[PDB]
């Protein structure tokens, strides 16, 4: 899943911006889009840096796809969509990464593994 | 502590929900209902394979009572309670478990190392 | 980054909270406040204990800084802050603590590896 918080209003949030995230995070990751779950959080009380600009705190957590290479990559495609659709500066978004064991993420009544 | 985040509206959310969850969590991991923390966030923008029909992304951060047979067995107790209550398909479900160590847990102005 | 979630309303939360955590945090991990992130969530649906007495469930995540030393002294330093500020018992308060690595914390396009 891919989760955005961010102090910008959710009026600011265009329509259509969770299926671009869906499409754009299933082409990266290389898996089918029904595996991908997004959210997005705005009107957040938030400060980077002291400051009140817009900003975003994210995550990302897959069963593998993760890694030094592929993180750049996706960081790249992340802060870029948030800076054209969102307006936030890509100087104030952190994005952690997880990459997570089957074992440990639940779905269907029983997990990945 | 066990947090789900929902596109379930509040209104659906029944009376008893977080006693429920808290009860069955402190029967499941087998730790008294004094230490279980519990966080419903309703409302929220969210999507799961491109869909916005119900859906839920869960955590369970416990330090210990995490691994594979234990974690299928909650994902059947969570993805239950969420079905039956909210009416979410336990297939529009992700739950996340992070066996934290006790060092990395703080409370009461100190950890639990 | 570090982020309180609470079921304390918006209006009990003081003027000032973000900018003094942000001033405290960079003061106890050594980091320079521009890079600290901070991030509030009040009238949460939350439970500990099975009670909704006022709580907190928080997380910090850190590129080092990560430690049993000195997650104890976060835990002191942050459950002072929201039982000053917020009027919440610190036993009524967990925090995670994230050691990340460089490579998994994406900021300004790219990552910190």
Not at 16 to 24: A, V, Y
Not at 33 to 55: K, N, R, T, W
Request: charged letters at 15%.
């Amino acid at each position: 899943a891919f989760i955005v918080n961010t102090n910008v209003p959710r009026a600011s949030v265009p329509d259509g911006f969770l299926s671009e995230l869906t499409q754009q995070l299933a082409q990266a990751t290389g898996k089918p889009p029904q595996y991908i779950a997004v959210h997005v959080v705005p009107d957040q009380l938030m400060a980077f840096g002291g400051s009140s600009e817009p900003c975003a705190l994210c995550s990302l957590h897959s069963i593998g796809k993760i890694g030094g290479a592929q993180n750049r990559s996706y960081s790249k495609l992340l802060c870029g969509l948030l800076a054209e659709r969102l307006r936030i500066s890509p100087d104030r978004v952190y994005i952690n990464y997880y990459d997570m064991n089957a074992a440990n993420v639940g779905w269907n009544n029983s997990t990945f593994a």
